[PDB]
Write a protein that binds this ligand. Structure first.
Ligand code: CRS
Ligand code: CRS
Ligand code: CRS
Ligand code: CRS
Ligand code: CRS
Ligand code: CRS
Ligand code: CA
Ligand code: CA
Ligand code: CA
Ligand code: CL
Ligand code: CL
Ligand code: ZN
Ligand code: ZN
Lengths: 21, 28, 28, 21, 29, 21, 29, 21, 29, 21, 28, 21
């Protein structure tokens, strides 16, 4: 999930967009 | 782990801005 | 408008803490 | 919607919990 | 009550920084 | 009260210090 | 104490929310 | 104190209520 | 006006996210 | 400035990017 | 890293309060 | 740079004021 992806290594704005509605 | 808890707080603030009117489901 | 945008930022932060492992959907 | 319910009249923490997963 | 709630949220963050090791006791009305 | 003193006119960091414990 | 500072910043925001009209005290180490 | 109790393992909102006024 | 003060607080947080390693200048004048 | 442009009307992240370094 | 990103988020909030009408420059 | 100065060793409010405009 987003925590496993983006807390061990930094996520770009586009990578965060993958979690949007 | 508290640090992962604080990280998730910032992630949802980022999702709020990034996702706009689409909104988001936060699934921890 | 802006006041509603700022309200939502705070709403998302509170949902994060209130909802815990359940997660939440943010639909506006 | 949570914005309509909670940004004019304040919402309690119980009312916020309505929107959890 | 919404504006006072939003304001108070930023006030306690400000007190946290300003007060440092002293801490603080936040009282609302 | 800090809310009454500081939520419509801006309080300086100095004024806020008066609320430290 | 950077970790303790980041933790306390989030603690005060959570206490503000949980405690409501009761207010709260923040007393760091 | 709250830093000992809550800054390395997560405190629930119920646990945090112990520090309310 | 406090509401303008609170707005700027969120602006700088958005600027932090948007600008990244580019950094930014906050010029509130 | 940013305050006059973005506190009376909502600014997108793209508009906010103008103030980037 | 993440730790640097999260620390920086708090740095810019603190700079906002400390600097007031002077503004500030955030440059990592 | 501010990250190097303040994200491993904590900075005071005075040290932060170094970065005001
Ligand atoms: C938190 C916020 C933004 C990005 C991340 O990777 C983690
Ligand atoms: C918490 C934050 C913002 C609005 C609410 O109604 C409750
Ligand atoms: C800082 C935050 C919120 C209100 C104030 O007057 C000052
Ligand atoms: C919320 C914030 C910081 C620490 C905790 O344990 C809980
Ligand atoms: C505050 C934050 C983000 C956008 C705005 O227009 C205002
Ligand atoms: C983050 C906030 C305030 C001070 C620091 O050194 C780091
Ligand atoms: Ca904050
Ligand atoms: Ca916050
Ligand atoms: Ca924030
Ligand atoms: Cl606000
Ligand atoms: Cl953090
Ligand atoms: Zn944080
Ligand atoms: Zn706010």
């Amino acid at each position: 999930g987003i925590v496993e992806q983006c807390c061990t290594s930094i996520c770009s704005l586009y990578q965060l967009e993958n979690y949007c509605g | 782990f508290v640090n992962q808890h604080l990280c998730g707080s910032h992630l949802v603030e980022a999702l709020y801005l990034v996702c706009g009117e689409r909104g988001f489901f936060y699934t921890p």
